[PDB]
Ligand code: NI
């Protein structure tokens with residue numbers, strides 16, 4: 797079953813109304829926040845709240861771009877959640893679930909807790925039906941031209957099942 801998923805009300809998400817997406821998502825994109833990292837709940841919460849505002853205010857997104865985020869606390873934060881579109885990858889925001897690891901992982905990778913959480917969340921995703929049984933996993937930089945999710949992180953995920961080798 798899905799990990800603890802700390803809801804939007806927890807980190808005080810500015811509430812909005814964004815374009816819902818047809819849930820049988822066919823892909824999974826692993827992206828990294830590229831910004832600061834967090835190790836305790838209260839810190840991750842603040843970072844998530846700020847990524848949303850930035851995304852809405854200066855990026856002009858409808859809400860935070862990611863469906864879910866993962867902190868070094870091993871906690872899984874709801875982004876826009878399952879039922880909403882994302883603003884994370886071009887032409888995939890309505891068909892790919894974007895999971896953002898909070899922090900910067902080009903050299904060093906997320907800890908084992910952060911990683912275990914993503915895979916557990918991905919699993920229930922396929923199990924619950926939010927992901928097609930034959931969905932395809934891939935890195936952010938595999939679809940668009942971006943320095944994400946970082947070598948370290950990339951090398952780990954390329955290891956996971958259904959990864960688009
Ligand atoms: Ni599970």
Ligand code: NI
Pocket residue numbers: 912
């Ligand atoms: Ni474990």
